[PDB]
Design a protein around this ligand. Structure first.
Ligand SMILES: [Cu+2]
Lengths: 21, 29
């Protein structure tokens, strides 16, 4: 998932918004 | 904005920045 994606690859701040409440 | 390489505590910093008072879930494998 994103914890993996951001670290192993890259991610955007827009992808991170998906994890907001 | 630009793409991010974020591991460990640096990811949770970015989550905090993006979500703020909305709060967020940090859910690894
Ligand atoms: Cu560091």
């Amino acid at each position: 998932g994103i914890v993996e994606q951001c670290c192993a690859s890259v991610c955007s701040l827009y992808q991170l918004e998906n994890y907001c409440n | 904005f630009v793409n991010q390489h974020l591991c460990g505590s640096h990811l949770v910093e970015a989550l905090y920045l993006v979500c703020g008072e909305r709060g967020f879930f940090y859910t690894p494998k």
